[PDB]
Amino acid sequence: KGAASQNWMQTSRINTAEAARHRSEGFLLLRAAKPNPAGGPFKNSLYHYPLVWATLTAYCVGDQARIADLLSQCRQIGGRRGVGCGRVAGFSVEVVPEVECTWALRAMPDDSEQSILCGEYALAMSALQSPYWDRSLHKPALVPTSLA
Amino acid sequence: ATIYASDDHAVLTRWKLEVPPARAIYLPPVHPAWTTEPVVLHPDRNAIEPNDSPEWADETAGLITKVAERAAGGTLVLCTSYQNAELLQGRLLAVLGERLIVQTKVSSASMCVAQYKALYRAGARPVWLGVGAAWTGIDLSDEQATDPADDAMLSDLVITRLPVGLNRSLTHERRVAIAGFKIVTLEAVWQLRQGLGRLVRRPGVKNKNLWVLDSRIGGNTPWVAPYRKLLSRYRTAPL
Amino acid sequence: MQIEVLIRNITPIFSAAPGSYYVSLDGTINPPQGASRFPLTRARTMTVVAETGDGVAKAVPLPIVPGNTMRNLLRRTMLKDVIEPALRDKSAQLSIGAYATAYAGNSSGNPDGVPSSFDEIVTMRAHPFLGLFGGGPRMLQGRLMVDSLYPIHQFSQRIIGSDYINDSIKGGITEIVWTRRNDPILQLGSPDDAAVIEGGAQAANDWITSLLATTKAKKGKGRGLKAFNAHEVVIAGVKWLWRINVDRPSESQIGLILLALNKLANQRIAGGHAKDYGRFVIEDVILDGESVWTPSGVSGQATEQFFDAIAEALDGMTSSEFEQFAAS
Amino acid sequence: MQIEVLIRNITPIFSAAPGSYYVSLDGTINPPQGASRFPLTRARTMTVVAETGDGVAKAVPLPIVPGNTMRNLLRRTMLKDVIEPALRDKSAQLSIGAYATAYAGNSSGNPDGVPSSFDEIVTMRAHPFLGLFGGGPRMLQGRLMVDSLYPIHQFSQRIIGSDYINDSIKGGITEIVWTRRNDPILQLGSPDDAAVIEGGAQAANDWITSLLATTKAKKGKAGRGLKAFNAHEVVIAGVKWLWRINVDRPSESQIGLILLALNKLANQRIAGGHAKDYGRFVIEDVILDGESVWTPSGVSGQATEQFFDAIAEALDGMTSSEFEQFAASAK
Amino acid sequence: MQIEVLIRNITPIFSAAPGSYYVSLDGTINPPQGASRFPLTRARTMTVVAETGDGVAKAVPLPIVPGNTMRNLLRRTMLKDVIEPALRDKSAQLSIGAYATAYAGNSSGNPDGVPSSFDEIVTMRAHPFLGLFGGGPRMLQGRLMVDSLYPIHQFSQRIIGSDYINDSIKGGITEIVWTRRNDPILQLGSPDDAAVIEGGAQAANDWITSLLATTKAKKGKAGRGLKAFNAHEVVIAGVKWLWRINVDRPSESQIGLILLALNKLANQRIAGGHAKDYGRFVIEDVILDGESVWTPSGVSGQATEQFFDAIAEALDGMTSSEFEQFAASAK
DNA sequence: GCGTCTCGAATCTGATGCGTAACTTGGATGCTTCGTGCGT
DNA sequence: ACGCACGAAGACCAAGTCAATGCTTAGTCTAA
């Protein structure tokens, strides 16, 4: 992190006066008398996610040319890309000696060999192949403690 | 030679010379090995602020006098303005005498550079106190000696100031108003790099020496960091 | 497809930052306990790294407008300026699920979670409006990726770029505006003023007595109308750059974006409706490096196809498409 | 709907800027501690971006009138000259809470926090007066977008546009005025003047002795006496101003109400300085959606005829029940 | 209610602007440091916007009389001509605090922090005098708007309108008057002249020798003696002035009191220069809501009879009880 | 038809007070289920 | 005649914080 993490705040709300006007004019078919900001169609919601300035470095085994070509079309990193978070100023792909840092800092399968693991590995539930948010694909896996 | 800066990425060029944002294309920087390696910087820093005080002139004159005594051959002392040179030439003339030659309002590269070239070939070990004009354009390569590695007509050179705010164009004032003090610092970095352009104008130079004379580089003030980065490319003299 | 919109705000832009922050009369943010403190609603500032004061890197706050606010503003502009009139022209009516999906992408209409067939995804992601803003019970991935409204400032050089260096502002761009609320009863001066009040002089006397008693009790240890406070806003006249990208856009979607940009000037940015904050005028719109902003709005020979496509889409648009998208 | 009002102030406009400021007798703001300083209440200035002939954009102060202050001015003008006379013609009475909410937007400092029904929102936003300002115990979004009072100045050219350049003023438009308070007892000169004072000579002697003792104690140390000498900063008279009013999808009744307010606005005053007759102004031109609708009589013409008819009908049908419903707390 | 008073000054008007300004002996204001730097007390001027015939908005100074000075002049006129005779006949004596509050708007420099009850506000705002002049420990808004005394000049045409073009003056209306103070002892040059001073000629010789020593020491260095040479800048005599007094919703008695003051206002001075008989003026015309109500005798006519009558009964029923209530502290 | 001399000089060259007061010193919302009954 | 409206209700502990940015000094002549 080039700077401390910033807690970013975003909300969600349907304009109640605009909806009332549409309800009056027949654009909206709602018979309910009042909006409910606590829940339902007109719920106001408050959520937060952290924003960080960072340089993304990771290690892999593959083709330099093809990986560089794939990363050429990448414009945004991480998530919340619809609101423009994590634009890519640039990228670099370099060949480095194996002794620097291994590719093991990831979700390895449960019975992975100890010799290839860099550092401590805590057992947890995570997916081994992308997509990683699919909870039906979640399996017990060794997740690096010094990276989570 | 001063298009791309260390961190500006030629933005100053695109702004000074207005170019459409899409029409401009940058190029990677290049530098031959014989441009940075064959020179070492002496750690003889200046102990006084580069003002116009007579005592600062005395100390700088003594430092550059011992440099000239130690100088291998023809040397160049980079003076920013006529005010500093005139304040400095009086002390030098006591020891150097005729060996020192300085620009005037009339004296310039019309004949002074030719005279310096002739005197250097004569073995006088001449000292050229450049003022503004000598900062850019004039040639200090011993073209006749086609080794080419002679490194004697400009064996040594000394800088008296960074400099700071040499450009006085109203466009520069507009730019410094728009962007702040950052632009003038990197413009002075450009000027300092331009002054180093006098050091080499032929390939295969082998051994030259450099002196820095400004207490600001030794005062550890935050804004001279780009100058530190620029001079850090050059190995210091192991004194 | 990259859209670069150069926005200059005529009036100050006020995006309220969460939190209870205080200020003193002299203007000191978060004054110490010694002096009086007044509540302050600061502008939305994002911590960014920049070369401030010839430093290598400084994490200085930059007053911006959140990207989600810009996204919602664009959605509201489309809805209130092209989509809603087009649906009204057909006398279309939307259920609560379809309307919630259309105006906030809320899945309340069918929170069960509906599968989407590949043909359905192809048809719907090609919708001129709902494709750009995914959501609803289906909850697709929208084709619109709008950036935050970063001001053209010295600290935003590494976020905006150096293409618009001529319009940058060196100093701070935030100013504190003080508000005040006065009790109308204390400003009565004659029985003619109190004629409209049903209680006349007696009601005003009771109101003032209650106010005095409450104030005395509060001093010794129900809140009245009187209030003094300030809110921080970004100074007017500063130029802003808005970057919009549409991933794999159809002609209809680009036409809709151009129409929204045409009608965007009539809307406001962020908050401040009471004080007419956020008013702005579009200065330049850039499509894939080509300037398109004419003095009469977005026009030109290179955008007629988008306008024709979006007009054709508006001609044949029906509420049934919204219902199908919202699974209603 | 965009309304642009062109205002030239007959008397200087003085809007107090919060915070303590000091000035010396010469006129130097925030003088060095060595010189004598006097309290100063500066005219409120909002930082704005101004472009010059050099092309550089810089932040400079600009003396303006806050949007909130003259929004309240417009509300008070409407209530005093259009709404309240209409209510009093039919002998309609408002409760103290209804009056407080009509004049300030709330009956108390604690909002209800309960959402309003859709039909109530539509009815209130269709009200000629309540629709413009909204507010109430349950926050209702008003239709009136009202802007601050920007003087037509070289600094405000970027803000107010270049179509009013003919009325711009180049130099500074701010001047400082000094005020003094005198102890009346120090101007007594005969027992006839002190004959009306109870006790007379004894009372005056006690007052002067106490004043001298207090001043001597204050001087040696290095309540408050009547003597005072300070200054307050005002905007010079004769400068033109631009007022911009926007309404979100206005009904004809609300447009007519705003036009009537503009007709009756000249009798009111913009900012503070009631004793010094500050804030007096005359409206020069009113622009409605890019069209001038101002005559020497005022807002008039067939273009504004329908707005006036609609607002007259609404006022004839205007009752206190709407205000009582609007200001009724949901709790 | 608008009242316009046309005032012409018989003698020069001298309202001194605070600040130390210097003038050379040839009339140049703020000369170079090389020349002499005699002190000057300039007349107070407010910058105003005026057209020089080309329609350009040029900010130029204008020698005026402060509005606060005129307000206090009107207050003093009413008190010393109307209120004081009325209270005296009934043997009603104001307390020292009531006297100070009436003559200065406050009995001390620390106003109360609590608002006043509505009954008190109604009673005070209806009072013939206290209603016009607000103030007191509880900040109360008065009914009087006193404007500055703007001279009818080409620069003030934009401010005061084009109604008084025939009375406008083009050239500068400001002049410098030189003042010198002599040391009496130096002029004393007879043994009979010194026959009154104790010690005879010895005291005069000691005075002269002390003066010589002091001036020699001060010149060598490069108290203060009696010798002086100064200058004060005054507005020339004979120019016409426009005075605007505006009152919001007045009772009959208050307007009657204002008219009574205007009848007896000419006997007072405008501002400053008591020793040199500065500030003398004569009222040319009084405009009452667009109608001239000024007779050669004074404020008279069939139109204004009811105001005078009403203020007459108001004075007859007046007492000191309301003054004591107004000036009483609420803490 | 001019006529020239003289065609200034010294000295003052500011003093004193006042040189803030009171009050506001935030307020509200951001949850779904469950039972019972309308109800279009 | 299943769908939607609408109040009551049930979890219920509970702090420490609230800046993030200051910085200097005169040569050019090679188009009217």
Numbering used by the authors:
A (entry chain F): 75 to 222
B (entry chain K): 480 to 718
C (entry chain A): 1 to 221, 237 to 343
D (entry chain B), E (entry chain C): 1 to 222, 237 to 345
List sentences quoted exactly from the publication behind this structure.
Here, we present several cryo-EM structures of two evolutionary distant type IV-A1 and type IV-A3 complexes (from Pseudomonas oleovorans and Klebsiella pneumoniae, respectively) bound to cognate DNA targets with and without DinG. The structures reveal multisubunit DNA-surveillance complexes that intimately recognize their DNA-targets to form an R-loop structure.
Finally, we present the structures of the types IV-A1 and IV-A3 effector complexes bound to DinG: We show how two Cas7 subunits recruit DinG for handover of the NTS in type IV-A1. The structure further revealed the complete NTS path from the PAM to the exit of the helicase. Examination of the DinG interface revealed interactions involving its α-helices 19, 21, 27 and 28 and the wrist loops (WL2) of Cas7.1 and Cas7.2, along with a loop extending from the palm domain of Cas7.1. This conformation places the arch domain near the center of the complex and aligns the HD2 of DinG for receiving the NTS, which extends from Cas8’s CTD across WL2 of Cas7.1 towards DinG. At the center of the interface, tryptophan 494 and isoleucine 657 of DinG form non-polar interactions with isoleucine 165 of the palm-loop in Cas7.1 and valine 56 of WL2 in Cas7.2. Analytical size-exclusion chromatography confirmed that the R440A, W494A and R653A DinG mutants are properly folded and soluble. This suggests that the interface formed by the HD1, HD2 and arch domains is crucial for DinG recruitment and subsequent transcriptional interference.
